[PDB]
């Protein structure tokens, strides 16, 4: 499809964000509105690699 929900979403994100990890990196930030904002769009609407990449950490 064009959407991702549940564990397939989580597995896809883990693979996409490699060793960097999630931007939303702590239990408390995974419950955040910003996190949910991205997740609700992927699941309910459309999810693409660009949207997914916004979910990743951005270390130097």
């Amino acid at each position, epitope marked *: 499809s064009e959407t991702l*929900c*549940g*564990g*397939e*979403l*989580v*597995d896809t*994100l883990q693979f996409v964000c490699g060793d960097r990890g999630f931007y939303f990196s702590r239990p408390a930030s*995974r*419950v955040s509105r910003r*996190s*949910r904002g991205i*997740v*609700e*769009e992927c*699941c*309910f*609407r459309s999810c693409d690699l660009a949207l997914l990449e916004t979910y990743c950490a951005t270390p130097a």
Partner: antibody, heavy 122, light 109 residues
Framework: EVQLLESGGGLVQPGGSLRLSCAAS???????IMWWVRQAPGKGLEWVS?????????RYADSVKGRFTISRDNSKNTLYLQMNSLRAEDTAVYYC???????????????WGQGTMVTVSS | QDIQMTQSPSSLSASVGDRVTITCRAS??????LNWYQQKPGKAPKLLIY???TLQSGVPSRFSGSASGTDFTLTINSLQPEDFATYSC?????????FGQGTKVEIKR
């Protein structure tokens, strides 16, 4: 005491309309993605509908698309399922349920309504 | 294409204090995203276990879950009389977050 208290089930003729309500208490309702799940007589549980936490996005099982509408009113701490063009095969116990996780359904549904029966019959 | 869930056995009868083993299979790969619910007759299900082995809070330690290759098992160590219920698995990988049909556990007293 976290609680989902459902109301609104009953008897309705084929082609008819019913609206279920699920009133939440003991938690911050607006943080949670909410679910409708049904159980038809001698069948398994099945997803009906899901709504995001704000309410602005929704998703439906194929069997109900175009006919049911889920919504929520965060101000009143309540979840709704509007059931139209009701068919006999929609007869079931209807549960509301809260999302246990963060990625829409990835850790199951932790908190459940008590169930409300919906009978579609002449 | 929608993932189908299969349990074994569909029912069992076991004695208080026994170890009970219930299997769930997915027809496609669900990673480790498998939940267990306990449903007593005419009641809302109760979440026991999510992500194959994570016990939900308030749930007795006698309930445990395992991935078992490409199988999943719920274990009830020390079956109790309260445990009489249907135990159902649910894949949490994708839509439609499909529930299995359940395994009826009877207490052999």
């Amino acid at each position: 005491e976290v609680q989902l208290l459902e109301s609104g089930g009953g008897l309705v003729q084929p082609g008819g309309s019913l609206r279920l309500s699920c009133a939440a208490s003991g938690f911050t309702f607006s943080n949670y993605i909410m679910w409708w799940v049904r159980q038809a007589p001698g069948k398994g549980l099945e997803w009906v509908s899901v709504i995001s936490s704000s309410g602005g996005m929704t998703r439906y099982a194929d069997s109900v698309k175009g006919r049911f509408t889920i919504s929520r009113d965060n101000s009143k701490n309540t979840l709704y399922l509007q059931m139209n063009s009701l068919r006999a095969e929609d007869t079931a116990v209807y549960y509301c349920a809260r999302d246990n996780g963060d990625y829409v359904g990835e850790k199951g549904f932790d908190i459940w309504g008590q169930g409300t029966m919906v009978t579609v019959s002449s | 294409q929608d993932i189908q869930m299969t349990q074994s056995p569909s029912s069992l009868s076991a004695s208080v204090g026994d170890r009970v083993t219930i299997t769930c299979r997915a027809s496609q790969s669900i990673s480790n995203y498998l939940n267990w619910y306990q449903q007593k007759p005419g009641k809302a299900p109760k979440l026991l276990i999510y992500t194959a082995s994570t016990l939900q809070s308030g749930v007795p330690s006698r309930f445990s879950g395992s991935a078992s290759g490409t199988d999943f098992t719920l274990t009830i160590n020390s079956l109790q009389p309260e445990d009489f219920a249907t135990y159902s698995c649910q894949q949490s990988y994708n839509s439609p977050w499909t529930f299995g049909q359940g395994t009826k556990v009877e207490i052999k007293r």
